[PDB]
Amino acid sequence: KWKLFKKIGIGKFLHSAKKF
Structure with a gap:
């Protein structure tokens, strides 16, 4: 449960x- 969850697949996302 950390702020890494918001980047698990968004940065390179x-x-x-x-x-587009």
Whole structure:
């Protein structure tokens, strides 16, 4: 239960936001 849960798959997630 830490702030890492908000980055378990979001940091590299926004990387796809570039194709959109």
